[PDB]
Structure 1
Amino acid sequence: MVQRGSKVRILRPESYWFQDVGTVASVDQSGIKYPVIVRFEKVNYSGINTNNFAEDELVEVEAPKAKPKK
């Protein structure tokens, strides 16, 4: 589940930030090309920092917990 704060991988071959984990800034539910907003640290050929992606084009890859079960 992609909430505000969860980091996800980018699966958009068009996005300069392919194969990189960004952070979800906010989720808009009204009708846009990318309901979920993602943030990055690097830039691209256009010189951007934040963009918008769809949840289906993102994978959840947060730092796993170091404690399966005691």
Structure 2
Amino acid sequence: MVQRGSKVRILRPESYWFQDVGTVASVDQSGIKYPVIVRFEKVNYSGINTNNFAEDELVEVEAPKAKPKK
């Protein structure tokens, strides 16, 4: 469950942006191959910077955060 504008890594060895922390732009709830759309700053062999990945192919790699309670 990532958020619109979070930082998760890509687990798609086939994707040019594998092992990279892309940012989530939005999710498409309807029925496609990758509900979550991930943006990228780098490009691939062709020249793109916006692909689609599934929430299962994204890990949350955020830094430490303070939570409620002690």
Q: TM-score, normalised by structure 2?
A: 0.88
Q: Report how many residues are paired.
A: 70
- Displacement of 1:15 after TM fit? 0.6
Superposed structure 1 runs of 4+ greater than 2 Å apart? 63-70
Take 1:45 and 1:68, find their aligned partners in 2: how far apart are those partners?
A: 45
Identity of aligned residues (%): 100
Take 2:49 and 2:31, find their aligned partners in 1: how far apart are those partners?
A: 22
Q: Which sections of structure 1, spanning at least 5 residues, go unmatched?
A: none
Take 2:25 and 2:51, find their aligned partners in 1: how far apart are those partners?
A: 10
Between 59-68 and 18-27, the greater mean CA deviation after superposition:
59-68
Aligned-residue RMSD, C-alpha = 1.9
Q: Which sections of structure 2, spanning at least 5 residues, go unmatched?
A: none
Q: TM-score, normalised by structure 1?
A: 0.88
